[PDB]
């Protein structure tokens, strides 16, 4: 309860950590920790009745977020870990179920069968791109095939529990918490041409309420980088 | 009986990945294959369960001959000999049958006469990174990952024939060794559309039945 | 010199052999290892995790997210079948394309048991009771709640616990996991009544797979 | 007798093999060794020595000895770029044909650092001051003396010391070694003002080369 | 990773140095190669980094056949056999196919039928001096150095054919062993003009750019 | 390398030989044994039991 990092404080009360490992450290690298280890809270999305899902690219969403956006442009390489706090606040009269996954290397596929999706359609800088429950038409310029039941990666959406995940069931639970290490083939990689993670939120059992209750449940995603180190003189 | 599901017993198998023809007289008969994992649709699905792999390689070639229709006058040929050149990542590339790139020094090539055991050879783990990457969410063009590039294979005759044409096929076999796998992923549901990327058309999750009961 | 004598089977290429091979590129000094998290030593470790089961196919939910939701409403009939599916393996059943049934379609002989985790994805003000009857291989499907009660079953109280776990063997009739209404869904004012249920499947103890083959989910 | 069984890959000529070979001329009793000075055990020992760098190409000094001289004169402008060259490897840069860049074009993967020795080949009565700014990979080239001062740099006093040594990593933008005027060249009577500067390059620590190839400086 | 730049891993490679043709019926078909280091332009540059070398030698020959157009009437030939004679420095030299110098006793020659493994052989370090000399500033004619002279190789058929002509090519491979190097030298900038001497035409030092900044 | 010299009778298929053979399917982990009653180690154990003799043939 009331954990603080740097000059920011959140409030909690179960945490699932990575693939079993805690994030730790390793020309020579420099290790900054004061101006990066803090809670960057993204703005809140609205979960309505006919919602489909959201996704963020993780070393892209904090690209304009304070001094962490300055270390992405001034330094060439770098490696980070993450600590993702998801919490949605609903009353006892609402119902639903979310699935919160953190997929490493989520290569997505274009709607046009010959091209690859362009840069603005894969990742929004601290703004969630959204799923659909239909198909996206092929004859357009360039967009992501974002049918939710195939998760945009050509794979059955029920089997997405093999990646490190956590359930948010509004009957019993309220929040999720993930701690993710650095998973890449090279020990230190570029932070502009590569997104090594992907945070997905998919409503399996959709929201329901009676007439009179508030028709939306806001979700709040709070990310804090752990054990970051860069490469420079 | 739980040991046949180990990674060594699941991925160290042999598979026919390529099949090409080339003849000697036609001034452009030589084979070509960029070594990759996304060639045959079945081995691609067995390696797309994992994200990062790291294996050695062991290749075997089954080369056979076939006599093309010559003109006349009692054709009789000696035993043939083939050359299978391996180009490392970032090496010289041939374009014709008679070229400088065949006679180079840093490309290891095998020489093999017909009527013997097939010419095996083994390629080590060549990369700058610490593992191969079966998936890549990032730009180099989206989703290419120039770091796992294993090389190219080239085949040709080394006999010049004056009285009869001869064409030949070649079946390249593929066998990983000392495999290590990391970061397991869900198996692919949709069909494979292209070779380079992960494009698809959306299909239903499971084959349907009449009712819930 | 040393006299040898070759046996039959000398200059042949058996595809499943194990011989030493001449290295094409020696003297290379390859890249050493790096400790990457999440190493898989055995393919059963993929089958041990739990996955959602599409038990609501019905010909137009398969291209949707409605395949995983079991519709539960408060009806007027006293006792009715909620769902039911056989465990007959691979015959177009609902455990076919899941993460368990995706690995077991690579092998032809397998044997083990199964965890069947359920979850009530409804409100916190709604109560009810459910039966979870399991018929053995050989016994028929129960056509009524009363002789579904006389077989082996678990009565699931929704207001007390929100998840019921069931262990069951599965071999290569083969069983039924029919589920029945006990009482209706009691609900207060200004709460919706139509709730839903998810279904999970996993591997409880060690499966034993043997005789690998290729998968039939391909062209 | 002894039963053998030949594997595939038996009667083949792999070019990079290592087998024993029948000697054509035995019983020869070859000439023994003689201690000749200057034995090279490793090719890095050639790359450790220093060589002059032709940083003054400009399309008509390449067929001359003017390629190695940096022209330094006492101008009237306050602050000006003396020279500057990238460290982008092999893209027609000035470290290409030197003794360091002649060995590293035989290998495709290499990594290490670099000594950059300078020397003022002028009179003993002339003084001055120079900046030696190094921009990292990713940062741009400085367009002005002031923001070349804000990056990492070394102020080189000519009247005190006659040689400045600079260490810098070099990998396969990639950096800039731009050099700027601080003050003009003060000089007494009956001394010439147009002095020159040489540039040396070497290998500071151990490079690590791998994956040999053939050289591209051939027909 | 500093061991692949050792002298053993830098110079002990295989290279195609010679390629010649000869036929049996034409009364002057036999090959000839004086063994030297200045044949191919790439291996000459890798050995001109050092002044004094000392190595054993190991040679491999890839001999193949080709049927020339005969007259008529059902040509059929048995398996061919080749003879590869090595002449030491200061030995008898043949001039015709049928000559006394082939049947001598001090020239070690290999005999090889077609359809087998290629005929390797290994030549030791033969010299009076304690090392080979890649450069020589002195007269014997300027810059010859008669002390490092390794010998000559000769190839011919040993079958007489009555019904069909057969020509054959041969690719001599070159591989030093147990190499020792002394007195390292700067790499050559200019192109190679002749085989015997160090003649050149002067070229610029580095490719030019637009300005100094 | 190691110099060998093949004797006569090298590449022949004698039907009553005993050589090791390359296994077609390794890595199988076969079914273990089960104690079944009535194991026959030798064919004489069939001949030791008694049988009725047809000593009254007489053609019909």
Which tokens belong to A16? 């699932």
Chains with 3+ CB–CB pairs under 8 A to E are: B, C, D
Instruction: Please tell me if residue C11 touches chain F, with a CB cutoff of 8 Å.
Output: no
Say how far apart CA D86 and CA D94 lie, in whole Å: 9
Is there a contact between B81 and B109 (Cβ–Cβ < 8 Å)? no
The helix or strand, by DSSP H or E, that contains position E42, with its residue range, turns out to be helix E41-47
What is the maximum span of chain A, computed from C-alpha positions, in angstroms? 63
Say how far apart CA A146 and CA A140 lie, in whole Å: 14
Alpha-helical (H) ranges within E52-199 are: none
State the structure-solving technique.
Answer: cryo-EM
Instruction: Please tell me if residue C15 touches chain D, with a CB cutoff of 8 Å.
Output: no
In E, which residues are within 8 Å of B103 by CB distance?
Answer: 16, 19
Where are the extended beta strands (E) located within C122-204?
129-132, 155-157, 165-171, 179-181, 195-201
Give me the count of residues in chain E: 213
Instruction: Please tell me if residue F50 touches chain B, with a CB cutoff of 8 Å.
Output: no
Which tokens belong to D98? 């030197």
Which tokens belong to B165? 């044409």
Please, do chains D and A touch (3+ CB pairs < 8 Å)?
yes
Instruction: Please tell me if residue A186 touches chain D, with a CB cutoff of 8 Å.
Output: no
Q: Looking up tokens 């650092």, which residue turns up?
A: D113
CATH label of the domain that carries residue A188: 2.60.120.20
Is there a contact between A89 and A194 (Cβ–Cβ < 8 Å)? no
Which tokens belong to B169? 């096929």
DSSP secondary structure of D15-38: TT------BSS-S---------S-
Minimal Cα distance from B104: which residue of E? Answer: E15
- D152:A27 CB<8 A: no
What backbone phi and psi angles, to 5 degrees, belong to E93? Answer: -120, 125
Minimal Cα distance from F8: which residue of D? Answer: D1
- E42:B160 CB<8 A: no
As to burial, measured by CB atoms within 10 angstroms (0-12 exposed, 13-18 middle, 19+ buried), residue C178 is buried
> What range does the domain containing E192 cover?
1-213
Q: What is the DSSP letter of A151?
A: T
Which tokens belong to E169? 């090519």
Say how far apart CA B142 and CA B144 lie, in whole Å: 6
Instruction: Please tell me if residue D205 touches chain A, with a CB cutoff of 8 Å.
Output: no
Q: Which residues of B lie closer than 8 Å to A, measured between beta carbons?
A: 51-52, 128-133, 135-143, 147, 183-190, 193-194, 197-205
Helix (H, G, I), strand (E, B) or coil at C118: strand
Residues 6+ apart with CB under 8 A from C29: D210, E1, E3, E4
Q: What is the number of domains present in chain A?
A: 1
The CA distance from C83 to the nearest CA of chain B, in Å, is: 5
As to burial, measured by CB atoms within 10 angstroms (0-12 exposed, 13-18 middle, 19+ buried), residue B25 is middle
Picking from A104, A110, A195, the nearest residue to B51 by CB comes out as: A104
Where are the extended beta strands (E) located within D81-194?
81-83, 107-109, 111-121, 129-132, 155-157, 165-171, 179-181
Q: What is the DSSP letter of C161?
A: -
* Chain B from 1 to 40: CB within 8 A of any F CB: 1, 3-4, 9
Is there a contact between E28 and E36 (Cβ–Cβ < 8 Å)? no
- Residue of A164, A161, A134, A163 whose CA lies nearest to A147: A134
Picking from F1, F19, F22, the nearest residue to D19 by CB comes out as: F1
DSSP secondary structure of A17-46: ETTS--------EE---TTT-S-EEPPPEE
- Residue of C56, C82, C187, C71 whose CA lies nearest to C121: C71
The CA distance from D212 to the nearest CA of chain C, in Å, is: 9
The helix or strand, by DSSP H or E, that contains position B82, with its residue range, turns out to be strand B81-87
Is there a contact between A9 and A2 (Cβ–Cβ < 8 Å)? yes
Alpha-helical (H) ranges within chain C are: 44-47, 99-103, 145-149
The CA distance from E70 to the nearest CA of chain D, in Å, is: 32
Say how far apart CA B159 and CA B161 lie, in whole Å: 6
CA B201 to chain centre: 27
Q: Chain D interface, mutation test: which of C11, C13, C21, most D Cβ atoms within 10 Å?
A: C11
Interstrand relation of C2-6 and D2-4 (parallel, antiparallel or unpaired): parallel
> What range does the domain containing A111 cover?
1-233
Minimal Cα distance from F14: which residue of C? Answer: C8
Instruction: Please tell me if residue D9 touches chain E, with a CB cutoff of 8 Å.
Output: no
Say how far apart CA C33 and CA C30 lie, in whole Å: 9
In F, which residues are within 8 Å of D20 by CB distance?
Answer: 1
Which tokens belong to D94? 């000035």
Hey, which residues does D132 pair with through a beta bridge?
D179
Which tokens belong to A115? 């091209």
Helix (H, G, I), strand (E, B) or coil at D147: helix
Q: Chain B interface, mutation test: which of C57, C100, C214, most B Cβ atoms within 10 Å?
A: C57
Burial track D83-107 (b if 16+ CB lie within 10 A, e otherwise): bbbbbebeeebbbbbbbbbbbbbbb
Cα three-residue angle B48-B51-B54, rounded to 5 degrees: 100
Hey, which residues does B168 pair with through a beta bridge?
B22, B65
Cα–Cα distance list, B98 to B27, B85, B102, B156, D13 (Å): 9, 14, 8, 10, 21
- Residue of D209, D206, D218, D204 whose CA lies nearest to D103: D209
The CA distance from C195 to the nearest CA of chain B, in Å, is: 16
Which tokens belong to E141? 């004619």
Q: What is the number of domains present in chain E?
A: 1
What backbone phi and psi angles, to 5 degrees, belong to C6? Answer: -75, 135
- D213:B126 CB<8 A: no
Alpha-helical (H) ranges within C34-188 are: 44-47, 99-103, 145-149
- Residue of A158, A36, B210, D78 whose CA lies nearest to C68: A158
- Residue of A193, A197, A184, A202 whose CA lies nearest to A225: A197
- D212:B106 CB<8 A: yes
In D, which residues are within 8 Å of B127 by CB distance?
Answer: none
Helix (H, G, I), strand (E, B) or coil at F25: coil
As to burial, measured by CB atoms within 10 angstroms (0-12 exposed, 13-18 middle, 19+ buried), residue D199 is buried
- B117:D6 CB<8 A: yes
- Residue of D71, D181, D69, D184 whose CA lies nearest to D131: D181
- D42:E202 CB<8 A: no
Say how far apart CA A225 and CA A39 lie, in whole Å: 8
Give me the count of residues in chain C: 219
Instruction: Please tell me if residue C21 touches chain D, with a CB cutoff of 8 Å.
Output: yes
- D13:B113 CB<8 A: no
In E, which residues are within 8 Å of D56 by CB distance?
Answer: 212
Minimal Cα distance from E205: which residue of D? Answer: D62
- A161:C125 CB<8 A: no
Instruction: Please tell me if residue B93 touches chain D, with a CB cutoff of 8 Å.
Output: no
Residues 6+ apart with CB under 8 A from D36: E52, E130, E131, E182, E183
Minimal Cα distance from D19: which residue of F? Answer: F1
């Amino acid at each position: 309860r009331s954990i603080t990092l740097g000059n920011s404080t959140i409030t909690t009360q179960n945490v699932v950590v990575g693939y079993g490992v805690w994030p730790e450290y390793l020309d020579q690298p420099t290790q900054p920790d004061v101006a990066t280890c803090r809670f960057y809270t993204l703005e809140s999305v609205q979960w309505m009745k006919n919602s489909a899902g959201w996704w963020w690219k993780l070393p892209d969403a904090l690209s304009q977020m304070g001094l962490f956006g300055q270390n992405m442009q001034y330094h060439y390489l770098g490696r980070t870990g993450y600590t993702i706090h998801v919490q949605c606040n609903a009353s006892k009269f609402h119902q639903g179920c979310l699935l919160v996954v953190c997929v490493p290397e989520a290569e997505m596929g274009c709607s046009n069968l010959n091209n690859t999706p362009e840069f603005s359609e894969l990742s929004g800088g601290d703004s969630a791109r959204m799923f659909t429950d239909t198909q996206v038409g092929e004859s357009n310029a360039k967009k992501v095939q974002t049918a939710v039941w195939n998760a945009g990666m050509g794979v059955g959406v029920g089997n997405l529990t093999i990646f490190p995940h956590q359930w948010i069931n509004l009957r019993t639970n309220n929040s999720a918490t993930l701690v993710m290490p650095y998973i890449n083939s090279v020990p230190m990689d570029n932070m502009f041409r590569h997104n090594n993670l992907t945070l997905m939120i998919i409503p399996f059992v959709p929201l329901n309420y009676s007439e009179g209750s508030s028709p939306y449940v806001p979700i709040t995603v709070t990310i804090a980088p752990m054990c970051a180190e860069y490469n420079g003189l | 009986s739980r040991s046949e599901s180990s990674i060594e017993n699941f991925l160290c198998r042999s598979a026919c990945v390529y099949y090409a023809t080339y003849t000697n007289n036609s001034k452009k008969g030589f084979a070509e294959w960029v070594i990759n994992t996304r060639q045959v649709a079945q081995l691609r699905r067995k390696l797309e369960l994992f994200t990062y792999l790291r294996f050695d390689l062991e290749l075997t070639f089954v080369i056979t001959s076939a006599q093309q229709p010559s003109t006349a006058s009692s054709v009789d040929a000696p035993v043939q000999t083939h050359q299978i050149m391996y180009v490392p990542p970032g090496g010289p590339v041939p374009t014709k049958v008679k070229d400088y790139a065949w006679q180079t020094s840093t490309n290891p090539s095998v020489f093999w006469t017909e009527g013997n055991a097939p010419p095996r050879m083994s390629i080590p783990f060549i990369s700058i990174g610490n593992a191969y990457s079966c998936f890549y969410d990032g730009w180099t063009v989206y989703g290419i990952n120039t770091l796992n590039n294993m090389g190219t294979l080239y085949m040709r005759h080394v006999n010049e024939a004056g009285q009869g044409p001869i064409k030949s096929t070649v079946r390249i076999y593929f066998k990983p060794k000392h495999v290590k796998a990391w970061v397991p992923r869900p198996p692919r549901l949709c069909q494979y559309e292209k070779q380079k990327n992960v494009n698809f058309s959306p299909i239903g999750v499971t084959t349907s039945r009449t009712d819930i009961i | 010199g040393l006299p040898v004598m070759t046996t039959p089977g000398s200059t042949q290429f058996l595809t499943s052999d194990d011989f030493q091979s001449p290295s094409a590129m020696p003297q290379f000094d390859v890249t050493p290892e790096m400790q990457i998290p999440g190493r898989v030593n055995n393919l059963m470790e993929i089958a041990e995790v739990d996955s959602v089961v599409p038990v609501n196919n019905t010909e137009d939910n398969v291209s949707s997210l409605k395949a995983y939701q079991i519709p539960v409403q408060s009806n007027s009939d006293n006792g009715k079948q909620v769902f039911g599916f056989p465990l007959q393996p691979g015959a177009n059943n609902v455990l076919n394309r899941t993460l368990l049934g995706e690995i077991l379609n690579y092998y032809t002989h397998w044997s083990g048991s199964i965890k069947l985790t359920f979850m009530f994805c409804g409100s916190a003000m709604a109560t009810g009771k459910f039966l979870l009857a399991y018929s053995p291989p050989g016994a028929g499907v129960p056509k009524n709640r009363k002789d579904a009660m006389l077989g082996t079953h678990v009565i699931w109280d929704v207001g007390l616990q929100s998840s019921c776990v069931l262990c069951v063997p599965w071999i290569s009739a083969a069983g039924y996991v029919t589920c029945w209404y006990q009482t209706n869904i009691v609900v207060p004012a200004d709460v919706q009544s139509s709730c839903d249920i998810l279904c999970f499947v996993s591997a409880c103890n060690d499966f034993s797979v043997r005789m690998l083959k290729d998968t039939p989910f391909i062209r």
